[PDB]
Amino acid sequence: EGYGKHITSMHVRNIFNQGNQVIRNIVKQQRYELLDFTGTEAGTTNLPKIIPYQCIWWRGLQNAANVNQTINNMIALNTISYGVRFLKAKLCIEVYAVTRKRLIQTGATSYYTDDFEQGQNLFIGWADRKAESIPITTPADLDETKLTVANTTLFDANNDNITKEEVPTREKWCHTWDLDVLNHNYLWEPNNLDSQWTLIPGAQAVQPTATPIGPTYQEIVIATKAIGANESALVTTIQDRRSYPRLMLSQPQIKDETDTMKFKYQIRISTELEMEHHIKPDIANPWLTRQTLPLPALSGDGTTRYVPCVPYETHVSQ
CA torsion 150-272-72-193 (nearest 10°) is -40
Cβ contact 103:110 at 8 Å = yes
Cβ-proximal residues to 87 (8 Å cutoff; 6+ apart), any chain: 178, 179, 180, 274, 275, 276
- What residues does 174 pair with on adjacent strands? 92
- What residues does 249 pair with on adjacent strands? 49, 124
DSSP 294: P
What whole-number distance in Å separates Cα of residue 8 and Cα of residue 26? 42
| DSSP-derived 3-state class of residue 140 | helix
| Conformation bin of residue 170: beta by default, left when phi > 0, alpha when psi is -120 to 50 | left
| Helix ranges restricted to H, the chain | 69-80
Burial of 57 (0-12, 13-18, 19+ CB in 10 A): buried
What whole-number distance in Å separates Cα of residue 281 and Cα of residue 143? 37
Q: Which H/E stretch holds residue 203?
A: none
**What resolution does the deposited structure have, in angstroms?**
3.1
Q: Which of 95, 92, 123 is nearest to 30 (CA)?
A: 92
- What residues does 32 pair with on adjacent strands? 268
Q: For the chain, how big is the Rg over CA atoms in Å?
A: 24
Chain CA centroid to CA 166, Å: 21
| Helix ranges restricted to H, 257-297 | none
> What are the φ/ψ torsions at residue 190 (nearest 5 degrees)?
-60, 130
Q: Which of 64, 57, 92, 71 is nearest to 28 (CA)?
A: 71
Burial of 177 (0-12, 13-18, 19+ CB in 10 A): middle
Cβ-proximal residues to 224 (8 Å cutoff; 6+ apart), any chain: 232, 233, 234, 235
| DSSP-derived 3-state class of residue 291 | helix
Q: What's at 50, amino acid-wise?
A: I
Cβ contact 210:230 at 8 Å = no
What whole-number distance in Å separates Cα of residue 104 and Cα of residue 109? 8
DSSP 229: S
CA torsion 63-154-267-28 (nearest 10°) is -50
What whole-number distance in Å separates Cα of residue 290 and Cα of residue 187? 9
CA torsion 168-169-171-175 (nearest 10°) is 70
Sign of the four-CA dihedral 127, 301, 148, 59: positive
What whole-number distance in Å separates Cα of residue 24 and Cα of residue 4? 40
Q: Which of 102, 148, 95, 151 is nearest to 121 (CA)?
A: 95
What whole-number distance in Å separates Cα of residue 264 and Cα of residue 76? 38
Kind of pairing between the strands at 121-126 and 247-250: antiparallel
The H helix count followed by the E strand count for the chain is: 1, 15
